[PDB]
Paper text:
Mutations of human CDC73 are associated with hyperparathyroidism-jaw tumor (HPT-JT) syndrome, which is an autosomal dominant disorder characterized by parathyroid tumors, fibro-osseous jaw tumors, cystic kidney lesions and uterine tumors. PAF1C participates in recruitment of histone modification factors and promotion of transcriptional elongation. To understand how the CDC73 N-terminal domain contributes to CDC73 functions and how CDC73 pathogenic mutations may lead to HPT-JT and other diseases, we have characterized the structural features of the CDC73 N-terminal regions and revealed a previously unidentified N-terminal globular domain. Here, we demonstrate that CDC73-NTD can form a well-folded globular domain, and is conserved from human to yeast.
LC-MS/MS analysis revealed that this protease-resistant fragment contains at least the first N-terminal 100 residues and likely the first 111 residues of hCDC73. We thus named this protease-resistant region as hCDC73-NTD. Furthermore, we have determined a crystal structure of CDC73-NTD at ultrahigh 1.02 Å resolutions and characterized CDC73 pathogenic missense mutants using biochemical assays. First, we determined the crystal structure of CDC73(1–100) using the SAD method (with a soaked platinum derivative) at 1.4 Å resolution, and then the crystal structure of CDC73(1–111) at 1.02 Å resolution. There are one and two molecules in each asymmetric unit for CDC73(1–111) and CDC73(1–100) crystals, respectively. The overall structure of CDC73(1–111) is almost identical with CDC73(1–100), with a r.m.s.d. of Cα positions being 0.894 Å. The extra 11 residues of CDC73(1–111) pack tightly on surface of the CDC73(1–100) core structure. Indeed, our Thermofluor assay showed that hCDC73(1–100) and hCDC73(1–111) have Tm values of 46 °C and 56 °C, respectively.
Author numbering: 1 to 111
Write the structure that this text describes.
Amino acid sequence: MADVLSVLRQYNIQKKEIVVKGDEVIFGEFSWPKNVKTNYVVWGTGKEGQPREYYTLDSILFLLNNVHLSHPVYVRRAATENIPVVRRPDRKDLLGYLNGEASTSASIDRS
């Protein structure tokens, strides 16, 4: 298996069933907690030697499952659910990666 975000991308591209049970997100045999950190850097972080920060799986999955909402409505929904938001400058790039428009991102740190 690759990293969790790459697995999420694979499942999304194939439209394979993803199971959310409690705080687990399940991809076939594999499971991660909702709060696992992905390798996608949050816009605005990692400047001037300061730490990079990363979106959680929950944050990314919540965006993916709510792509039909306008970004402003999505921001409000995310607040209601207490799930951190994907920042607007990351939205198009992250969704394009998840949908297989791209196979990497300048925001993904992956050795």
